[PDB]
Amino acid sequence: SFTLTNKNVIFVAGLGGIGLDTSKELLKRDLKNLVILDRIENPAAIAELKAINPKVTVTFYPYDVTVPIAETTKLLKTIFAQLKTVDVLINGAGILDDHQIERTIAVNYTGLVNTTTAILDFWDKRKGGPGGIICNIGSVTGFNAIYQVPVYSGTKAAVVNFTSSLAKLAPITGVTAYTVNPGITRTTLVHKFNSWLDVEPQVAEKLLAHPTQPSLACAENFVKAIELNQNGAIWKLDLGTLEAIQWTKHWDSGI
Amino acid sequence: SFTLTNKNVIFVAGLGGIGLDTSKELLKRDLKNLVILDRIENPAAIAELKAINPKVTVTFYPYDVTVPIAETTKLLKTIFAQLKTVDVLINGAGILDDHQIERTIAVNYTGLVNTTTAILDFWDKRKGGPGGIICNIGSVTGFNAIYQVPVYSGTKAAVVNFTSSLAKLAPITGVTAYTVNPGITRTTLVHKFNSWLDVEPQVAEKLLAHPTQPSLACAENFVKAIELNQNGAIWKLDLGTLEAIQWTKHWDSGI
Numbered sequence A, B: 001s002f003t004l005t006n007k008n009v010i011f012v013a014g015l016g017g018i019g020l021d022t023s024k025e026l027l028k029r030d031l032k033n034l035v036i037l038d039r040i041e042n043p044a045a046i047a048e049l050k051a052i053n054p055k056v057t058v059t060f061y062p063y064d065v066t067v068p069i070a071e072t073t074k075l076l077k078t079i080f081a082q083l084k085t086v087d088v089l090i091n092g093a094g095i096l097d098d099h100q101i102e103r104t105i106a107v108n109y110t111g112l113v114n115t116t117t118a119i120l121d122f123w124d125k126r127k128g129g130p131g132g133i134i135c136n137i138g139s140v141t142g143f144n145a146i147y148q149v150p151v152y153s154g155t156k157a158a159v160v161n162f163t164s165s166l167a168k169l170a171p172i173t174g175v176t177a178y179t180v181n182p183g184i185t186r187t188t189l190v191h192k193f194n195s196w197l198d199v200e201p202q203v204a205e206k207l208l209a210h211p212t213q214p215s216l217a218c219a220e221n222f223v224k225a226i227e228l229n230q231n232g233a234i235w236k237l238d239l240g241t242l243e244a245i246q247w248t249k250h251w252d253s254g255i
């Protein structure tokens, strides 16, 4: 059975609203190492995380997912030299700002793809690596968009589809994967944000008038999903529950 | 009832395998103008297109969809100075090469989004424009991936999701939209191509063992879908036919 006990986890975007709560939730278990990679530099959050569980070593490295893949490789080299093995990679970076088209795509899709691609060099069983687990943070918008943020939603559709494909490639690579797709979660991401071409200037207000869940509840279900360790899962973390999507079979390549 | 008669159409990627056949099919109708934008330079094809229908004016402009949006704006300014009005925009650029991660995303999703965003400056009714129609070329891989090209399939998932959102924004912008999503079509795109991290080196050979359709049949159904002019349609152009797809409602924002 899978357990987080004595595991080495890399958490990209571990200091954000959902990230920090998920990091705190993870530290209730006796991981060996929790390595947080983020562009947020918050020494006080790191101090808090180090204080939760004395049995876990918490390390922070500054990281911007939009750098070229060679730079990600350089940092992974440093982290694998420090840890030797990495069991789980959580790719959680995301921005919500449809005024930033290039950056939305670079952070939410390209960066996630590149960190995954870069860690496959250390883990791919075809290269003699040990395999690994990838947990990608998608979004319910990858199933059905928030149409007022069309660019963002399309990036999340890409993450869901890409992750489902990674899971189908597990037999070849040895790396399993799944998405955790939160519903609307109360963080700074959704407190105030820009709709594409300002189609809906009151998008944040309108969205937050409907049901949401706190980041603590999302984090609880995020770690429960990790512990279930189900390759190919399309987990939905909405309104405080943990559910899973049955993706519609519209077409099949035959291969 | 919508008609292509006397319309002005901009077709990005109108000279490729599907593109050129669709351009020929469009010229069976009495368009006012067909403006082909592509990075392919094929003067013989442009002369051939001009000769199909003497009532239509065919103009070619070299164009690479990966340029920054301000460049696309400069080109569109020129086309609107040339023709005054544009009725339909077809975004059809695509590459299939999972060894080119950044370029696959830049061509298949970012470029499409940018051309759409640039033309909205001219068409958005909130900018005093006349509205318009956007036809985006997706792919069946946006419904269900070819998992051996996970980066490409994710880009197409993004196009389908983004286009659906454009259609929901029509009441605000005046710009309607739909995707045409071909199944496997016999063009040079699929004769030989690279899988992500070479997970499947014989991906083209394996895929081509399964059913494919001619690009001419795809083109016939592409123009039929344009003539149906259904805002929000998700068209599947597979095995020589045209069918709508009903997208599953897994989640709803409430707005």
Ligand SMILES: NC(=O)C1=CN([C@@H]2O[C@H](COP(=O)(O)OP(=O)(O)OC[C@H]3O[C@@H](n4cnc5c(N)ncnc54)[C@H](O)[C@@H]3O)[C@@H](O)[C@H]2O)C=CC1
Binding pocket: A012, A013, A014, A015, A016, A017, A018, A019, A037, A038, A039, A040, A063, A064, A065, A066, A092, A093, A094, A095, A107, A137, A138, A139, A140, A181, A182, A183, A184, A185, A186, A187, A188, A189, A190
């Ligand atoms: N809050 C919500 O309603 C939902 C959030 N999501 C996703 O959850 C994840 C976290 O979102 P929240 O915690 O709500 O937002 P947030 O804004 O508090 O956190 C975003 C996280 O991404 C990191 N990040 C952003 N750009 C980065 C870059 N270039 N390099 C490295 N890290 C970068 C931030 O520093 C932070 O760790 C994102 O992937 C978001 O798209 C999914 C669905 C719902």
Ligand SMILES: NC(=O)C1=CN([C@@H]2O[C@H](COP(=O)(O)OP(=O)(O)OC[C@H]3O[C@@H](n4cnc5c(N)ncnc54)[C@H](O)[C@@H]3O)[C@@H](O)[C@H]2O)C=CC1
Binding pocket: B012, B013, B014, B015, B016, B017, B018, B019, B037, B038, B039, B040, B063, B064, B065, B066, B092, B093, B094, B095, B107, B137, B138, B139, B140, B181, B182, B183, B184, B185, B186, B187, B188, B189, B190
């Ligand atoms: N052939 C197939 O099985 C399928 C094709 N598709 C899509 O259909 C479209 C056409 O593909 P095919 O005709 O089969 O392949 P193709 O390789 O013959 O045509 C690709 C087209 O995209 C253009 N393009 C590529 N990069 C560009 C750039 N940077 N700027 C401007 N134009 C650029 C090419 O010059 C050409 O017009 C693409 O969007 C492709 O993803 C969708 C599903 C099935």
